Amino acid sequence: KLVRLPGLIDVHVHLREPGGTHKEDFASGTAAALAGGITMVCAMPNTRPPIIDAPALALAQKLAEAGARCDFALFLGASSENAGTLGTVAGSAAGLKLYLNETFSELRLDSVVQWMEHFETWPSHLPIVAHAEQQTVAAVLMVAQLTQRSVHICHVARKEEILLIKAAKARGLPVTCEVAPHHLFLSHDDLERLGPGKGEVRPELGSRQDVEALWENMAVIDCFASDHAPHTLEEKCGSRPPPGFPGLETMLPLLLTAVSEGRLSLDDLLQRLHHNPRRIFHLPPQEDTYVEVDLEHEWTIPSHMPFSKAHWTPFEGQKVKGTVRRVVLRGEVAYIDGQVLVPPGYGQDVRKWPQGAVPQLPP
Amino acid sequence: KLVRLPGLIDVHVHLREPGGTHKEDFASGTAAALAGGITMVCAMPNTRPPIIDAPALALAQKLAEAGARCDFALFLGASSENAGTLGTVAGSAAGLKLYLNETFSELRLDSVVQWMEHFETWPSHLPIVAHAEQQTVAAVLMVAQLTQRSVHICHVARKEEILLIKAAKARGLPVTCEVAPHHLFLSHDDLERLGPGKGEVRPELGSRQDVEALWENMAVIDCFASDHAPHTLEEKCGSRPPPGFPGLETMLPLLLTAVSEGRLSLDDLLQRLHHNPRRIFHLPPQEDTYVEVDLEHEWTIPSHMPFSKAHWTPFEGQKVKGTVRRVVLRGEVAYIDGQVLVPPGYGQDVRKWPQGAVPQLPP
Ligand SMILES: NC(=O)N[C@@H](CC(=O)O)C(=O)O
Ligand SMILES: NC(=O)N[C@@H](CC(=O)O)C(=O)O
Ligand SMILES: [Zn+2]
Ligand SMILES: [Zn+2]
Ligand SMILES: [Zn+2]
Ligand SMILES: [Zn+2]
Ligand SMILES: [Zn+2]
Ligand SMILES: [Zn+2]
């Protein structure tokens, strides 16, 4: 007996096109998404060229329309030069991404004043998300308060961070957050197995206490999002390993395993992979779209999942219970038991749908 | 014709006793203070042992009462273990010091949650000051807002920092700040002369643009404070140079030079070295206390000032106009033209004076 889920949404993926297509491209990354029960993705802007201006966004839109197999929205990225220049294209993007710490990214900002400038100039009704670790969470929250608007914190990974966000929510501040599966299912205990190259990720893997704190504070977590960050094994194991894990194909099976163990409910999962992503990012419904999962099937994660070009996974060897059997996207069978059945180009930019524009007051 | 100033107050000095007395002690550091026209100092807690508990404070109080030549108050320091334990001695201290970045300091905190715990437990009516650089300024401001109280930012050194504080003040937030003379009178341009050892300080020396921004935003600066941070020349020039500059003997002459050039007014100076320190830290008046200065005397700063045991200065070679001629402290001549005339032990802990207790609601 299969369980029918709505079309799940991942608000944090790196699809590497343009410029990093040996790691992933729209076609392979969205095949990975569908195999993971994900029908809509929001793609990050740290590509080459980075998506930090109108011409780069125009290029990315066309590459995505031609290559994507599931639906999508594209983030713009904040840079040290583009505050006040994105107004005409802002509404066409998923939101604005700020890179506020060292990571795989034309996009670290030099000064909190630059953060302020982005918060002041980006349209007030549109989403802003931040890579903001440890005290940077508190710093960007301060900027959001100074500018009287909301912020969403990407990949929360630490007890320190989730407790700070919890305190902010208790004070009624408009902040939301997401957590990635590696910060719920991996920890320092796994670094010996992974090694120092494969194990590189930002935020880094946490202690047992960090992981426990995220689970204990599930009520504070608004979304799950993979931070699918594919790099090849050669890159991960070479002399300058880039940070990041692939994750689209493993996220839902890991979380279904947790549901079957009673660690969170099916509803808790669907709030975090469907309803809250919709409402925070104003993402539209997908008509005649659903995912069928088998909650009884036990399997062990292999050394690589079938679709991501990363061709490795840090979850290798973990036992999971739960699998994606079928995905229907807008009335067409998109995935069945390991076979993707929609071509590159089937996916659409949801920000172009009438129902996908973010509502705003007449300007 | 001499000009009579009130007794000036330096709210940020390191006097090194206990535990670092080759660098400075209460007797030498307060001789330096008097020679710089300073009659009251607030001593930082990063000594050995650090002043992070009641027994250490008791020791420091006695060393200061026996050695100080000018009046003083002693800071307590926040640690990873002492939140919620300082309530009985808190009112006897200048305030609580938080070290939130890497510097010469049992006292970096590991987590913003520890900052929160200090803000929640330290008595709400007593001062909190923070070493908080760059985004850390925004982070500690957020903690202050979450806990509904004020904070004072030590040694502001950058355009980024002063503009963030300016924005916070424009929003009516209870934040004050101080600036040290090296961040007004030295910059990157001086690193070639100083060398990489002598030039080590936290916050580091800024660009020309940083320095210009502090002057342009003088209205945002509540206090001047030296961050007198003596280390010997051997230490500064050795294999692991500690950060910090001595500054008590040079601060007032540097600032008087600026006054004579019309860069700020005498009143601007006295607000920042007398009235604002009094009101932010609730420091009492000193009866029959004043400083006589000669604003016409031109001289060049030598390779070391007479009193600090640091026995070096980064301002060597700078031409100044203005000198301290005489200091009277509580009715006794304390300093005349290079001679200190009050003995170690003349100085008193102002927090023990009836008028030096911080007012509070009946608890
Ligand atoms: N998280 C990572 O380790 N890497 C991400 C960058 C990011 O999300 O910060 C990537 O794009 O490779
Ligand atoms: N500022 C410095 O460079 N050093 C100070 C420490 C401090 O004020 O942060 C010291 O105590 O030596
Ligand atoms: Zn990130
Ligand atoms: Zn994110
Ligand atoms: Zn990412
Ligand atoms: Zn400091
Ligand atoms: Zn200070
Ligand atoms: Zn200091």
XYZ file of C-alpha atoms in Angstrom, chain B residues 4 6-7 30 34 38-41 64-65 67-72 284-291 327-335 342-350 353 355:
45
model
C 41.810 73.962 33.293
C 38.065 68.473 34.763
C 39.485 65.112 35.801
C 48.329 54.892 36.948
C 48.153 60.901 35.577
C 43.637 60.993 33.389
C 42.415 60.875 37.010
C 40.174 57.805 36.862
C 40.604 54.533 34.981
C 44.676 48.181 43.058
C 44.071 49.858 46.422
C 49.232 50.261 43.921
C 46.956 52.742 42.166
C 47.951 56.404 42.134
C 44.694 57.590 40.532
C 41.152 56.451 41.197
C 39.720 53.387 39.501
C 31.165 59.531 40.480
C 32.630 63.032 40.448
C 36.095 63.496 41.935
C 36.133 66.394 44.350
C 38.853 69.053 43.966
C 40.229 67.355 40.888
C 41.446 69.011 37.707
C 44.053 68.978 34.972
C 47.130 67.323 37.782
C 45.388 67.781 41.129
C 43.544 64.732 42.465
C 41.251 65.154 45.460
C 43.112 68.194 46.715
C 46.662 66.880 46.303
C 49.153 67.658 43.548
C 49.447 64.378 41.673
C 51.588 65.333 38.689
C 51.292 60.863 44.778
C 52.442 57.429 45.932
C 51.159 54.002 44.989
C 48.044 53.498 47.091
C 46.752 57.066 46.873
C 44.075 55.942 44.421
C 40.708 54.557 45.501
C 38.004 52.249 44.183
C 35.248 54.641 43.160
C 32.203 55.676 47.403
C 28.177 58.424 45.200
